[PDB]
mmCIF file of C-alpha atoms and ligand atoms in Angstrom:
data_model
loop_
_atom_site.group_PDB
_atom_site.id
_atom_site.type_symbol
_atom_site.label_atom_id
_atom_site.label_comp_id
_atom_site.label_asym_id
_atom_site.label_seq_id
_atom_site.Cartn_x
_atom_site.Cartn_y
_atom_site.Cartn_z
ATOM 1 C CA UNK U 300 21.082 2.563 5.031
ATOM 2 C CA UNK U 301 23.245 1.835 8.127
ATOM 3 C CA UNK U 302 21.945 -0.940 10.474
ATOM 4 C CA UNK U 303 22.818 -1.488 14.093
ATOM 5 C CA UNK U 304 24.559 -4.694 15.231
ATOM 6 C CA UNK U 305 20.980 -4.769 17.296
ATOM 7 C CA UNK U 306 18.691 -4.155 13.885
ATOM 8 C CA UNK U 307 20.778 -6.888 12.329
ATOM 9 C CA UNK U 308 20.043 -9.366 15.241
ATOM 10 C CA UNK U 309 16.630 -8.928 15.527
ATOM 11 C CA UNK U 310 15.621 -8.587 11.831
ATOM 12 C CA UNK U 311 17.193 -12.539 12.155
ATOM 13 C CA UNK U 312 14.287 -12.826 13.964
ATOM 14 C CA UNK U 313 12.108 -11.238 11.515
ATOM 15 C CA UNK U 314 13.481 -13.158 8.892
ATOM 16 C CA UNK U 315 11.478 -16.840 10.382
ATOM 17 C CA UNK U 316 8.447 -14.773 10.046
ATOM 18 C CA UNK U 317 8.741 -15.547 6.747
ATOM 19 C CA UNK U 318 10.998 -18.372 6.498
ATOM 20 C CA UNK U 319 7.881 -20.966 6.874
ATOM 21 C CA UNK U 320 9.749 -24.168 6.611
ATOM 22 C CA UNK U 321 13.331 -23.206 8.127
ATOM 23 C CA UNK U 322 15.354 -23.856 5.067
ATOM 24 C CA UNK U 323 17.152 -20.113 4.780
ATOM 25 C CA UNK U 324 14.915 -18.900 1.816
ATOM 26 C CA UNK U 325 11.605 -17.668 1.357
ATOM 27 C CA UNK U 326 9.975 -18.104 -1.564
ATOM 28 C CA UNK U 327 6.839 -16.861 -3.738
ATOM 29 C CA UNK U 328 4.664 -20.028 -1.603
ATOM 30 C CA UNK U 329 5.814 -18.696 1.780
ATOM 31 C CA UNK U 330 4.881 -15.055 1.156
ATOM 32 C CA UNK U 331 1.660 -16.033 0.316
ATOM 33 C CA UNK U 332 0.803 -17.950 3.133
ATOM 34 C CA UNK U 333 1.984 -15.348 5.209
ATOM 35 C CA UNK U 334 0.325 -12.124 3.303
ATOM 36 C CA UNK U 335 -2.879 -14.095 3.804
ATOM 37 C CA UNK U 336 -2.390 -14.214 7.057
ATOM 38 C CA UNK U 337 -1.985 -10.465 6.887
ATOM 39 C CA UNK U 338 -5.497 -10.483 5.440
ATOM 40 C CA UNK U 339 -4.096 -9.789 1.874
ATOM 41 C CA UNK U 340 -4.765 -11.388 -1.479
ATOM 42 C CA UNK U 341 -1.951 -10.897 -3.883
ATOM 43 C CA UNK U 342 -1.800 -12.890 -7.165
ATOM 44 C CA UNK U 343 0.925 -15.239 -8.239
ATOM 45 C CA UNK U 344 2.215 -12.592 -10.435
ATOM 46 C CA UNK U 345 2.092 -10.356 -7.331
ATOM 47 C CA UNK U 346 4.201 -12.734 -5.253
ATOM 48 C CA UNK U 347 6.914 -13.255 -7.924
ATOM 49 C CA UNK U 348 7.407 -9.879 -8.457
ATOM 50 C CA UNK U 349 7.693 -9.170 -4.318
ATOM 51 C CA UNK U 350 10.905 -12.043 -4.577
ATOM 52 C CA UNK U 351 12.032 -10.598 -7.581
ATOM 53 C CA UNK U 352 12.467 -7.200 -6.814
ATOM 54 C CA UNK U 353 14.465 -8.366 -3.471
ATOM 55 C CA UNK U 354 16.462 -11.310 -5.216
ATOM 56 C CA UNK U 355 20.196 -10.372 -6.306
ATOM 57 C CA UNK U 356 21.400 -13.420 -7.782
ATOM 58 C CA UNK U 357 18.094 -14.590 -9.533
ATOM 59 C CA UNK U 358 17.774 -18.126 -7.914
ATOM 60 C CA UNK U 359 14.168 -17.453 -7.482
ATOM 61 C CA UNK U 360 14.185 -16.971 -3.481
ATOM 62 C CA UNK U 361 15.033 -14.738 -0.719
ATOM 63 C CA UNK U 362 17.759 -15.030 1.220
ATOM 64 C CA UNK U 363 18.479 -13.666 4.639
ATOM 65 C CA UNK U 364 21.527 -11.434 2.701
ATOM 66 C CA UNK U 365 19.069 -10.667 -0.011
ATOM 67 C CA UNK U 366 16.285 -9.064 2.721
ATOM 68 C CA UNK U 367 18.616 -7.820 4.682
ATOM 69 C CA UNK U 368 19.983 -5.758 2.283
ATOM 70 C CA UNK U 369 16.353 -4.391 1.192
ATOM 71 C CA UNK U 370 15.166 -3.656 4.904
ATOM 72 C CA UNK U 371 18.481 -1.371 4.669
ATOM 73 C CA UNK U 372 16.519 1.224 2.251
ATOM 74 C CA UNK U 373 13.345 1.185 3.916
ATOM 75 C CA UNK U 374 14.232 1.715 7.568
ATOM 76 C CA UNK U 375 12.058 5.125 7.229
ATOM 77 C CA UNK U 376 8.927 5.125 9.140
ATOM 78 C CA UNK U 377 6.370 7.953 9.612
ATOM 79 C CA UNK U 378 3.457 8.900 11.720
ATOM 80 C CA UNK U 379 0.303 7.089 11.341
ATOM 81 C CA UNK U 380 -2.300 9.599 12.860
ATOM 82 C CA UNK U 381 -4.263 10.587 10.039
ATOM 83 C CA UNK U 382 -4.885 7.020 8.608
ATOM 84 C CA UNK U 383 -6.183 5.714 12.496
ATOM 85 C CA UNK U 384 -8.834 8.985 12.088
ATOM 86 C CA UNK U 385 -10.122 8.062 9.028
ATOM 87 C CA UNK U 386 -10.268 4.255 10.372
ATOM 88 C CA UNK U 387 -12.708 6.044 13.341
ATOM 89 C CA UNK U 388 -14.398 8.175 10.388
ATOM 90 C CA UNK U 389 -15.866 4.746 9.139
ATOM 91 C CA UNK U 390 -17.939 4.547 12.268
ATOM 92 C CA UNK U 391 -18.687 8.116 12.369
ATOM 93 C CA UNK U 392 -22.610 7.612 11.076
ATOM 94 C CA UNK U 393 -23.529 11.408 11.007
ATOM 95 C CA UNK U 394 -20.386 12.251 9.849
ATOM 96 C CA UNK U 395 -19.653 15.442 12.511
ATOM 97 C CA UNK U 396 -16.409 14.505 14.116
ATOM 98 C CA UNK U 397 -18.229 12.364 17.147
ATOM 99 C CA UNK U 398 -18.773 8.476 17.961
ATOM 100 C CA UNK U 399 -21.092 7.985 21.016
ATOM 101 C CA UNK U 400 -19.815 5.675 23.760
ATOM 102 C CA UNK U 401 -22.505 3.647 23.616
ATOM 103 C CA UNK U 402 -21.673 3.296 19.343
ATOM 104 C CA UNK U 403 -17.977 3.131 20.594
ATOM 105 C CA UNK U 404 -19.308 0.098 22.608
ATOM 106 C CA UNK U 405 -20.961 -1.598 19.930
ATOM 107 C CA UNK U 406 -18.567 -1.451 17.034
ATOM 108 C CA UNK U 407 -15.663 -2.580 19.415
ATOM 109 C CA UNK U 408 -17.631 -5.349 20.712
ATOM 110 C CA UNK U 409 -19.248 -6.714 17.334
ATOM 111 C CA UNK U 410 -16.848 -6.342 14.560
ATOM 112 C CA UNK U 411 -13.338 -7.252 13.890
ATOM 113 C CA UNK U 412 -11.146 -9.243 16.412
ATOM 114 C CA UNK U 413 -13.544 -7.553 19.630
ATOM 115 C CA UNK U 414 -12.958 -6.555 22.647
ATOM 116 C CA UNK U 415 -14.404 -7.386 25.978
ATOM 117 C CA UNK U 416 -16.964 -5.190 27.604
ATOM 118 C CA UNK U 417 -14.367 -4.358 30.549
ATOM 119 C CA UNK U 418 -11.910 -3.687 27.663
ATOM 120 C CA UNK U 419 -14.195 -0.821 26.097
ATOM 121 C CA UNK U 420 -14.562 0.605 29.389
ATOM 122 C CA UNK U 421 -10.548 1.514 29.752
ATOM 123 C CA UNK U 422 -10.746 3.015 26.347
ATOM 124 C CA UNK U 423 -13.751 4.625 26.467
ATOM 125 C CA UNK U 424 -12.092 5.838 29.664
ATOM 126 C CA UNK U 425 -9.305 7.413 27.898
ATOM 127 C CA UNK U 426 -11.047 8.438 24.868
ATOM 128 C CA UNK U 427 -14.184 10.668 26.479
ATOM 129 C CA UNK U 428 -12.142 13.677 27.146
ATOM 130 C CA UNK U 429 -14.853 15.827 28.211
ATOM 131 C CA UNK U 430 -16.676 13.506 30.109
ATOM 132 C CA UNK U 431 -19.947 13.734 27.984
ATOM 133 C CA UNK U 432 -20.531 10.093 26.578
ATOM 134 C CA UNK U 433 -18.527 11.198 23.415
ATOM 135 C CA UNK U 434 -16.066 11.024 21.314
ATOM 136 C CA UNK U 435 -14.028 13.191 19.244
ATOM 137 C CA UNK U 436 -11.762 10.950 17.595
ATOM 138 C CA UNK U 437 -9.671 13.465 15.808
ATOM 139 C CA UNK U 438 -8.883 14.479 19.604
ATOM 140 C CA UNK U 439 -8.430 10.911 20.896
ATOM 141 C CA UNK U 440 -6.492 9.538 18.131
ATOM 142 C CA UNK U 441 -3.860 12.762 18.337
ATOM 143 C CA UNK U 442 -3.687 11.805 22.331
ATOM 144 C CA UNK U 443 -2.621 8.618 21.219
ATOM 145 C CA UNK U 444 -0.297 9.539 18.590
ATOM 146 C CA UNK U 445 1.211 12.272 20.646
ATOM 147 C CA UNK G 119 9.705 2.247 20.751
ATOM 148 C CA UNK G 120 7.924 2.367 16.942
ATOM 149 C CA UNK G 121 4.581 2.864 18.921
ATOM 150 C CA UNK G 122 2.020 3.518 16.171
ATOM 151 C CA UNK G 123 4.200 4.786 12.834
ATOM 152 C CA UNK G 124 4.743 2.630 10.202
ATOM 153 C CA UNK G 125 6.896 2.517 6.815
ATOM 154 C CA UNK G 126 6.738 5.522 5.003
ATOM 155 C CA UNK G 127 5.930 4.823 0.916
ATOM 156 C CA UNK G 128 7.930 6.378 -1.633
ATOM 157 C CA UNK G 129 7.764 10.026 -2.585
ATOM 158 C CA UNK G 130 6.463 9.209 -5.919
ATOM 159 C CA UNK G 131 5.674 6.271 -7.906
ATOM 160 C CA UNK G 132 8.803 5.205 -9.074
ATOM 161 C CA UNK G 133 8.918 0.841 -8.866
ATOM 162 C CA UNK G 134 8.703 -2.496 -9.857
ATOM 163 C CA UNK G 135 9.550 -1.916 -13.239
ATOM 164 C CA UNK G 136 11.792 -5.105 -13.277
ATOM 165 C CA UNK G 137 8.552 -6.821 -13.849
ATOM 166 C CA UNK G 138 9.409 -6.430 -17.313
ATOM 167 C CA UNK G 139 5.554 -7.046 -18.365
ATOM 168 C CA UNK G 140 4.643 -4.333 -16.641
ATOM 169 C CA UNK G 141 7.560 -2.396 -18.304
ATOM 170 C CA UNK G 142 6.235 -3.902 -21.553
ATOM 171 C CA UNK G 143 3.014 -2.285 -20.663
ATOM 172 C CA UNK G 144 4.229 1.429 -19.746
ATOM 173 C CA UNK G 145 6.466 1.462 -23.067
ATOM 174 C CA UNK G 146 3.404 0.355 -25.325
ATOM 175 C CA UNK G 147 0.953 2.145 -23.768
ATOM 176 C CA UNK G 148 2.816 5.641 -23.165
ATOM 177 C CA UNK G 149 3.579 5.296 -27.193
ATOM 178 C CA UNK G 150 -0.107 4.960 -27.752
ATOM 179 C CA UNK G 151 -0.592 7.590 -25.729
ATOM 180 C CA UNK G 152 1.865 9.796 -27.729
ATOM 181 C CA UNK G 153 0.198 7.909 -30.918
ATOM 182 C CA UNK G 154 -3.401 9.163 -30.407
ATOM 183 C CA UNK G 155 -2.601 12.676 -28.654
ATOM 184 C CA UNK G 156 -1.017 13.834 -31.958
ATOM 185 C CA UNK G 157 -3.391 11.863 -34.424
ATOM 186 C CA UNK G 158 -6.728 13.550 -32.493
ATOM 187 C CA UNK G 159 -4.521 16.914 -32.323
ATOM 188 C CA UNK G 160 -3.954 16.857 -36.494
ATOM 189 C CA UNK G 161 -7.591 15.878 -37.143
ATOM 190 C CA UNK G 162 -8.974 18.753 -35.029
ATOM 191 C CA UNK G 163 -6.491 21.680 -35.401
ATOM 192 C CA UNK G 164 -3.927 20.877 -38.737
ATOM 193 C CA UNK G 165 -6.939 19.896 -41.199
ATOM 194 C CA UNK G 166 -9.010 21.769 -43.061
ATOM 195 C CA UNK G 167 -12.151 19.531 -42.541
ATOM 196 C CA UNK G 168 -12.691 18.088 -39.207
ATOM 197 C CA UNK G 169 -13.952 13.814 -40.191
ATOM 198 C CA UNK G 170 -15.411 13.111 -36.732
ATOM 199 C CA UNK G 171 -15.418 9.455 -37.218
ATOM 200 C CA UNK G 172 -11.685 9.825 -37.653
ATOM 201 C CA UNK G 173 -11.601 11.694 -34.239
ATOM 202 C CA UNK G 174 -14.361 9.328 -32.333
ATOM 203 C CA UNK G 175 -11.253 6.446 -33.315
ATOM 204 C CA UNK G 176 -8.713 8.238 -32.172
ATOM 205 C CA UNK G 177 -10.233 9.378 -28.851
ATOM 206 C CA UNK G 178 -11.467 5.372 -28.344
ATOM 207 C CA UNK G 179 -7.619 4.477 -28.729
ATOM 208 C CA UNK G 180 -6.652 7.548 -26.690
ATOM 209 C CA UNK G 181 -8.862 6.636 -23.661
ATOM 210 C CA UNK G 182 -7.661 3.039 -23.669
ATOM 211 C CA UNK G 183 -4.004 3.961 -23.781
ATOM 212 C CA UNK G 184 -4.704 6.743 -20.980
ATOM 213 C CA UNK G 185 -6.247 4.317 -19.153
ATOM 214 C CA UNK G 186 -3.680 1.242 -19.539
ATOM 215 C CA UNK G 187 -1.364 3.846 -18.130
ATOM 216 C CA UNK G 188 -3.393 4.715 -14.959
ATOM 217 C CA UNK G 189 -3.585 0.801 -14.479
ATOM 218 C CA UNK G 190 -0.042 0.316 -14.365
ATOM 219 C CA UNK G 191 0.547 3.459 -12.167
ATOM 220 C CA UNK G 192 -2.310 1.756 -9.431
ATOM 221 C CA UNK G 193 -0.774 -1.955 -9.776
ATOM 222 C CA UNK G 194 2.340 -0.612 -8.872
ATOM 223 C CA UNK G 195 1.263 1.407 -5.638
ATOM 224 C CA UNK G 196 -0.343 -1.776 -5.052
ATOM 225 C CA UNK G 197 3.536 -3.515 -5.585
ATOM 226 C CA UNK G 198 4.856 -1.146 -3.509
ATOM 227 C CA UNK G 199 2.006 -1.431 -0.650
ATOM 228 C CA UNK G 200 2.213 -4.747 -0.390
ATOM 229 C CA UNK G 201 5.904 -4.660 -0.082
ATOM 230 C CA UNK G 202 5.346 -1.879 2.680
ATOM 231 C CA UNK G 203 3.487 -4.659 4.398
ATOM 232 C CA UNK G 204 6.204 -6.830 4.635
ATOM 233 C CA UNK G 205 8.777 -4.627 5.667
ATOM 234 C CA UNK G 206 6.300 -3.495 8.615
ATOM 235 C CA UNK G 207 6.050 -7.268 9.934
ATOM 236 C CA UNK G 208 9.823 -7.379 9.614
ATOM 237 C CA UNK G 209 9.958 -3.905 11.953
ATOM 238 C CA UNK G 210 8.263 -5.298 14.361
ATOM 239 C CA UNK G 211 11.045 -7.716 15.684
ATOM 240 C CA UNK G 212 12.580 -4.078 16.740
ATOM 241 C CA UNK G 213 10.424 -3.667 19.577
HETATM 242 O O1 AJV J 512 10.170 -6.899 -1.918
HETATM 243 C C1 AJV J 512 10.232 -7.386 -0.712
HETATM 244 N N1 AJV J 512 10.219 -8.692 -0.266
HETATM 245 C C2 AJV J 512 10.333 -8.708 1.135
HETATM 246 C C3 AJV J 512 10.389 -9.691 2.296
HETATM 247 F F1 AJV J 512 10.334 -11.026 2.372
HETATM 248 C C4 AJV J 512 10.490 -9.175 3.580
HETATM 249 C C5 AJV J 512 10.584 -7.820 3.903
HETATM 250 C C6 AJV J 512 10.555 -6.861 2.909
HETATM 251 C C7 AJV J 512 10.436 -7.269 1.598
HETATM 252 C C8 AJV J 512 10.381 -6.452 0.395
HETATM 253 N N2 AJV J 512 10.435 -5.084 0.328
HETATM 254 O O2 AJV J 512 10.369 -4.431 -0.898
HETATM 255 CA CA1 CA J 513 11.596 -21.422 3.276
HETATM 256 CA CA1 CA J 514 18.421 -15.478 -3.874
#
């Protein structure tokens, strides 16, 4: 636990992400609106015990001091290359290591956020290796991760 | 920068226990634990005459407790998940 002058600045930043309404605290109603914007669904009890585990003085709310002091401890980060292949494995229908282009193609333009056609073609680009309308996404995924 | 990597969780499940109803829940549920481990231990291997309705009791009360325990131990890699979350939004103000 040692942050920068630079990781103090910008986690000021950070700290508005959460901050809804400006006022210098967050509190159990802000982290909800902004986990569901994350796509997650914790419960009241949830929330509470997110501000609680982060609040020194017990007032009930975050303040920049407060989460500053817990981003401190959890500066550690590490590589994300096995959860992206099993995110790929979902697609994988035959379950033998390969996603066609043309499957590629469909899940990327169909589900989730999308992209556009010309927006597969880059990455199908980049992830056929071998040139042979497939992909090995164990392969791809440790390109990208490299 | 970060590129891909994200927060790394905990070795092991370790917190959250401030939540103090979850603590509740550990404490109560571990002692059951310890409660119906020896009570289905003594009616199987210290008596003389095995009562299996005794034992079916125990093992009910056993299972729950067992299982009360694995709830708390998921709820709080939820906790600690959803904690991970935030701290990843927050990391993103380093790039
Ligand atoms: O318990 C937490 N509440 C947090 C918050 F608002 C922002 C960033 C990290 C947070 C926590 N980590 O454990
Ligand atoms: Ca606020
Ligand atoms: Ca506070």
């Amino acid at each position: 636990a040692a942050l920068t002058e630079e990781q103090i600045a910008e986690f000021k930043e950070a700290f508005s992400l959460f901050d809804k309404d400006g006022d210098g605290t967050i509190t159990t109603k802000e982290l909800g609106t902004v986990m569901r914007s994350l796509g997650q669904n914790p419960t009241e009890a949830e929330l509470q015990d997110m501000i609680n585990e982060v609040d020194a003085d017990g007032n009930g709310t975050i303040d920049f001091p407060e989460f500053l002091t817990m981003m401190a401890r959890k500066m550690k980060d590490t590589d994300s290359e096995e959860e992206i292949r099993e995110a790929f494995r979902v697609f994988d229908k035959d379950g033998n290591g390969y996603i066609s282009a043309a499957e590629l193609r469909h899940v990327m333009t169909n589900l989730g956020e999308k992209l556009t056609d010309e927006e597969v073609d880059e990455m199908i680009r980049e992830a056929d290796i071998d040139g042979d309308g497939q992909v090995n996404y164990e392969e791809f995924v440790q390109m990208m991760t490299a | 920068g970060r590129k891909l990597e994200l927060t790394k969780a905990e070795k092991h499940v370790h917190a959250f226990m401030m939540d103090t109803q979850l603590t509740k829940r550990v404490k109560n549920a571990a002692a059951n634990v310890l409660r119906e481990t020896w009570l289905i231990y003594k009616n199987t291997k210290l008596v003389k005459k095995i009562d299996h309705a005794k034992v079916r009791k125990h093992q009910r009360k056993f299972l729950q407790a067992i299982h009360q325990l694995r709830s708390v131990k998921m709820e709080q890699r939820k906790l600690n998940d959803q904690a991970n979350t935030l701290v990843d939004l927050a990391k993103t103000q380093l790039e």
